[PDB]
Ligand binder design. Sequence first.
Ligand SMILES: CCCCCCCC/C=C/CCCCCCCC(=O)OC[C@H](COP(=O)(O)OCCN)OC(=O)CCCCCCC/C=C/CCCCCCCC
Ligand SMILES: *P(=O)(O)OCC(C)(C)[C@H](O)C(=O)NCCC(=O)NCCSC(=O)CCCCCCCCCCCCC
Lengths: 125, 104, 103, 87, 220, 164, 67, 80, 178, 128
Amino acid sequence: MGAHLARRYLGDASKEPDPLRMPTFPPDYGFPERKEREMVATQQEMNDAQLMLQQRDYCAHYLIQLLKCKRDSFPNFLACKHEQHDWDYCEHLDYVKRMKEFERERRLLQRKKRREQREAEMARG
Amino acid sequence: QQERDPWYDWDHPDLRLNWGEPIHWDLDMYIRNRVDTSPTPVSWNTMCKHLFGFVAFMLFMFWVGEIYPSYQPVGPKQYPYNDLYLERGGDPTKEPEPVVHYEI
Amino acid sequence: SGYTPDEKLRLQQLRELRRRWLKDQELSPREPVLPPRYKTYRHSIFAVTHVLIPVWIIHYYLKYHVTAKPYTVVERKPRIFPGDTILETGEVIPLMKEFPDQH
Amino acid sequence: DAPPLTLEAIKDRVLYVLKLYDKIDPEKLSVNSHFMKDLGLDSLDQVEIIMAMEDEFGFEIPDIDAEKLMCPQEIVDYIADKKDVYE
Amino acid sequence: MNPFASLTLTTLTILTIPIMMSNSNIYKTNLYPNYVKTTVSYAFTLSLVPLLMFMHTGQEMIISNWHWMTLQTVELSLSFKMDYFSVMFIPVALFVTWSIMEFSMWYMHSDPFINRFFKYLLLFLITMMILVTANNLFQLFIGWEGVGIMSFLLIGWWHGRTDANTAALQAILYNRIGDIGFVLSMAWFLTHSNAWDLQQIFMLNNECPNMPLIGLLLAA
Amino acid sequence: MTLCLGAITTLFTALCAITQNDIKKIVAFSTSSQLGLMMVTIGINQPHLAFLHICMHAFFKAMLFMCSGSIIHSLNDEQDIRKMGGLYKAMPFTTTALIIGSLALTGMPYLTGFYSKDLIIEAVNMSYTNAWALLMTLIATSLTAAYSTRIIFFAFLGKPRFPP
Amino acid sequence: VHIEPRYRQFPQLTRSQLIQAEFFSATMWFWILWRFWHDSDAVLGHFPYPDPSQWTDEELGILPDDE
Amino acid sequence: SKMELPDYKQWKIEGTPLETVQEKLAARGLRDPWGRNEAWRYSGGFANNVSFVGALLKGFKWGFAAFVVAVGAEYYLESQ
Amino acid sequence: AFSAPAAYLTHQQKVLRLYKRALRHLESWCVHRDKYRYFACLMRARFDEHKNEKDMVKATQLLRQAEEEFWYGQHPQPYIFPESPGGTSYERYECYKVPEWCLDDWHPSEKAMYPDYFAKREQWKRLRRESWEREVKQLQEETPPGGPRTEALPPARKEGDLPPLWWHIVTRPRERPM
Amino acid sequence: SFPKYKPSRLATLPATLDPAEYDISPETRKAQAERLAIRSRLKREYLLQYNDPNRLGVIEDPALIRWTYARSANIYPNFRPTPKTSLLGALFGIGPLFFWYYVFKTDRDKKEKLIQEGKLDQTFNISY
Ligand SMILES: CCCCCCCC/C=C/CCCCCCCC(=O)OC[C@H](COP(=O)(O)OCCN)OC(=O)CCCCCCC/C=C/CCCCCCCC
Ligand SMILES: *P(=O)(O)OCC(C)(C)[C@H](O)C(=O)NCCC(=O)NCCSC(=O)CCCCCCCCCCCCC
């Protein structure tokens, strides 16, 4: 649900991004110096914690901390609110990073369309 | 036998038959536990048309929704170690093609 | 349109007979002549038998018969988190690195 | 489950319904009154009376039998015999 | 020993106990419904205990107590998979069945065969427990067909009602089409994986194909 | 295939439910619609939410069937909402139990059914799913509310319609 | 307790069932209000949804069209 | 035991939607003779019934008071 | 059920059955009592409007059109009483109905458990056996030479007789046997 | 006016909508009288046998005996090889056999071709 579906289907699919092919531009295209994402939890730590493969994303350390907090205070199942909020906030930040990637792809596509239209106009004239 | 009268004092109430009357050749399939031919509030042709139309329309719309899916304005999810190369059963000896995710 | 006199008479006679039959169907004060041959206590007897005996038998069967052949009872290995104390060897699994904490 | 019916109870309830009928004068209504010979109703009125009794006692009277119930005593006897009432 | 396996198997066994007592004077008396309800309550609490054990440390187990038969390279054994799904669904089902049994004590008081009704309810519960805790496809199929036939027997409770008989047979027909799908999936899994248990099926089927998954979908 | 089958099942069963007059039939169609919702949950790759909804549905649907059975038994084996009525004050406890069960079924913001159905709907909307399946799921939720209102309205509100 | 049947009249009720029904309805409403007071984020959301139109091309790494 | 039927004269269609039906039928030129037999349903304890919104809010008044008291007690405990 | 059927339904019987069926389906449509009373009064008004009609051909055509209107406008799921043939509680107790011939195959110990019931049962059996010849004689005296033209049976014309063919009607199982 | 109801073989025409129900000839009434007379004669015979106190056993039903006999033992003596019967028998008894033969032979030929070419996933197929 959203306006992006309307723009892509009842509009210019060339200008709108394709979720199954994104990204289609190099990561450094437009970023002079871009920093690689940092992973806090190690493979051994995640493997020992037995996180499900879907849960082994870049927010895994907060999930591990939440699990450890829940296990220790077992009878009191309401004593992990801070850890839960930390994990949720990290997931929120990851989601907004994904949204930024989608928006960057979209405006790069429309900039490419403008550039190619300008080149075609110049070649014609 | 479903079409037969339920208020009559049949000799066999469950089968709705009388003793001595001729038995239909297909009584074994026209019993009340089996094929029913009693009249319906709507015509058979109308019922068939409506049912077929509903199922065909639903199949067509499922295909249309498949070719025009619904999603959110987000990019692909990112996983740390070469999209979890080893965790998904990859070969430790062979070196995977690196996958790098950058901040934004 | 209505009952003919014969139908009325037959129905009256049949209903009288039916009522007499039902009155006969009634039983007697001595009729079911049988041949010669605290709440906590009931719950206590129920609990020891129905719960204690099966758990005894099943624990005996599992501890000494089922858990005597390899791989019959397989427990999923316990989850190990950073900053933990493995009890088998007195091992200390170290804490994670410093988080880039926000707010 | 439910309390058993009795002949007096059936008679009381049928007379109660018939007295709540407007086309019937309550004073001259007795258990032997004929719906058409001495009450002045017609076929549709008898049909409505039978339907009211069906609603009252919660069971259906077949049309083959309901056409002949021309008296409150006949209705009482029919309902009692169908419900297996003997007292 | 860890109480987990003992307590789970004990709940299952004490569910099966009142069926054994169905050839006794207690079954001939009128105390059988209350007896069965009390048994279900005790089983419910005894199953609540391993749920507490799981929610603390996330304990899961499989118990291959009895070995049935070895078809050359395939071993079939009576195995129960006591995991999150089983230890979370058993107490809920027992709670619901306890409430339903008390309601049926009130509701079926006039039925001449209330004792048989309670025996049948307990048999359905036993088959459902077998289905839920089954670790291999054959035991899962046992529970599958058991709940199917118990549904057939309980739908047609009033044998004199032709509508009840038609409903029972119709339920059987649809569940048998589902069983067609189930047998397709079982045959494919055994043929292409030499296993009827979830552990080896998951190990060997890194990319499970359309034929077994569609068989399972049709059964479901 | 699982997602599409679940979507059409929940929609069709709710649509049939909103216009039935037998209370047991209404509850049976509600059960079928909830199963279709569970199948939708599986098809969007959320198996654990399906299990959670299984538990919650067990609770409140069993209670709803018990309440309808109490109504039927109190009215001499009558199973028609056309002949029920006035039971809001005639039967207090079964009335409050059925109202609570209907609120749980439709996802009252903090009852038993809220912790599963709300998450299921959120996951369906936020996933890469079939557009028609999403639309059918939403319509089925609306029709769920509709038939719960139908049960309450024709069974408890109004004037009696049962034999005197 | 034995409840006698009524004919064309409202059935006889009991103080016990009245108070029990009232107590359980009040319990449901108290629970709903109490949970909404404490954790209202489960209904109204917890984190704001960003507006993509407000993200600058500089921070999205988009070069000017001429460049 | 031996339940007694209430007197039949008490059932009337006055102050009942049945009298509105009777007025409509009188305007049409007709009458319905079964008014009172149905009029038992509209009187007595059956006369007043809550609405759909009123039915849902069966225990809101006591529940809200308990919620206010509990919130006040929690606030006092947190402060002290 | 208790009345022998006739060869055909007269016009009055047809119209009365249509009237009852229409009233029942209208009650199914109009759930509430006041609305049902209003529309039932209107329906009876239509029947009374066509009540006086000397032309039987026109009356039959009116009946035919009314039947077509009913079939078009019938309720798809009309209300059926629980014990009625379409009802949900129909034939529920047929599995509990056991006959008295099945009763007489009891073991002597079982029979001894109910000493008083079986004395009256023996009395009933003697009464049945002492009357069969009179019943068959009465039946064969009153039948026409061609045979029975209808399914109705005669009453007992004599002081000491019972109506012919009475045993199973009198001793039929109760509607709630167990 | 109102839409008409079209009867089918599985949804027959109701009696109230049958045109012959409202066109009664005097011969129709005598036909109905004869049918009722036949039914009443049969009913009387069955009832006399049923209420006979000295009867122990089963009232044999000649109609049921005729039905069971005509369903099984009377079919072959009354069968003649006709074009219709020959075509229907050949179809229903030969066509399915060769259809299934073609299906299975084609499937097994493809499987054997894959096996010979050595590009069929036969790993873990220990049981056969
Ligand atoms: C795998 C091969 C099978 C594929 C499907 C073939 C269907 C074959 C049908 C069975 C033949 C019938 C023989 C006798 C059956 C039992 C006797 C009988 O007919 O009783 C009818 C009985 C009673 O009727 P009521 O509606 O209850 O009315 C009651 C009125 N008092 O009703 C029935 O049971 C009919 C059931 C027949 C089902 C036919 C359609 C089945 C649907 C199959 C297609 C659906 C595929 C599903 C796709 C799933 C996607 C993963
Ligand atoms: P009593 O013995 O006085 O009965 C009088 C009768 C009716 C027998 C007359 O003596 C009589 O035969 N009169 C002449 C024939 C006649 O009146 N025919 C009328 C029958 S049809 C008619 O005209 C009225 C039918 C209109 C209503 C049709 C119903 C259609 C709607 C049904 C909808 C169902 C759900 C709403």
